[PDB]
Amino acid sequence: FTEIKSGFLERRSKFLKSYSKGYYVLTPNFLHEFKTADRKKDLVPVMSLALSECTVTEHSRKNSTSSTGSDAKFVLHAKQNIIGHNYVFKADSYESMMSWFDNLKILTST
Amino acid sequence: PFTEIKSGFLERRSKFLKSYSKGYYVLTPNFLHEFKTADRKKDLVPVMSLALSECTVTEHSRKNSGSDAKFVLHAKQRGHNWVFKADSYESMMSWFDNLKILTST
Amino acid sequence: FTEIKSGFLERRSKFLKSYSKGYYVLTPNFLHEFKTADRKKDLVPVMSLALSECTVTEHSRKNSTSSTGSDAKFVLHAKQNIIGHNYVFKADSYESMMSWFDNLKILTST
Amino acid sequence: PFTEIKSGFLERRSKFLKSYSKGYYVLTPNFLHEFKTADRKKDLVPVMSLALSECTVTEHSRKNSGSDAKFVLHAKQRGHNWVFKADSYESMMSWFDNLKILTST
């Protein structure tokens, strides 16, 4: 819109060992977080992460094991000071995770 | 924001504070972003991101013939009207026209 | 994609007094014509009309009368030399026509 | 094409004719367009419009340390590989990177 990908992801809290869910939109420039999927009424990102200073490092394998989504996670790494502290995201499936990861890898590659 | 369509300094008016503040604006197909500085390598988090899908540009200054370099950006969710001021009528018209074609829907 | 509008339009031949149908995509910059609606395999416009040198002039009223689509036409005018010779387009309905026209009017306005 | 992301002169190689030809390229979110000239007011019909949705940028020159300012644009519908040459490695890398982020899907 122009968007590369959009959908729900859960993001892990380092300290709280829990996840929070948001609706994410990946553009050529940013990973934006929104509270909802209503693109007509929910238009202010709660957060926008600039891809220029991120990298995606690891991701689950289809066979990765242990509770939910053990095969559906990826790590987004910061290269500049949101502090490089890593964000762990969890998608709904391996296939969905790989779609996010494959796009992020090219957008953040060198 | 390297799918940038246009960028440059603009002043934006605050209604309540009765003052202008200059920011560095970047227009993409999705947003008009405000950043504090023009350093696209170190200043990466927008101060503000205005979704183009619910903005329209309505009026602008008539050229002199006081600043004639202003335009209004209107919001729907709702009745909001930001006033911007560019360096010249010419620069204002570039912003206005570029915003217009990204906000026709 | 980024697109403002897309859909089927019929375009009139001045000399032949007949219409030909295409799939059109309106962007902030162009009115593109494609042979089909398959955005995955049909990717070369047969024609791209630059909006910078077009204007939309008249359009049908909901009550415009006489054979098909008498309430669904609009005229796209050229301001520079595709020669200003006018193109007449016909949409599927008044409502659809107005969507095309309203967008074109702002994109080509002064 | 005023939602232009990038524009500039590039040389494109013809495989059959064994020659380069310089054109003025305009990158939008949808296409890489070739125009004969840089006159955006009088030269309005693209010579060629390459749909980004089915292109990828694959390889590029390594910096010198012969031109080191080339990159390959690959097509799917299918196996097509256009070679482009920019004025410098630096200019080539700007094209390459801007194309890359519009062609990740």
Residue numbers in the entry:
A (entry chain B), C (entry chain B): 467 to 532, 536 to 550, 553 to 554, 557 to 583
B (entry chain A), D (entry chain A): 466 to 530, 538 to 549, 555 to 582
Task: Give sentences from the paper.
The PH domain-containing protein Slm1 from S. cerevisiae is a component of the target of rapamycin complex 2 (TORC2) signaling pathway.
In summary, here we present the first three-dimensional structures of the Slm1-PH bound to Ins(4)P and phosphoserine and show that the Slm1-PH exhibits a non-canonical PtdInsPs-binding mechanism. In addition, the ε-amino group of Lys542 from the β5-β6 loop and the ε-amino group of Lys562 from the β7-strand also interact with the phosphate group of the phosphoserine molecule (hydrogen bond lengths  = 2.4 Å and 2.7 Å, respectively). In the non-canonical binding site there are four residues that are consistently involved in ligand binding: Arg478, Tyr485, Lys542 and Lys562. The Ins(4)P and phosphoserine molecules superposed well on to the Ins(1,4,5)P3 of the β-spectrin PH complex positioned in the non-canonical binding site. The non-canonical binding site accommodated anions from the crystallization conditions, and also the phosphoserine molecule.
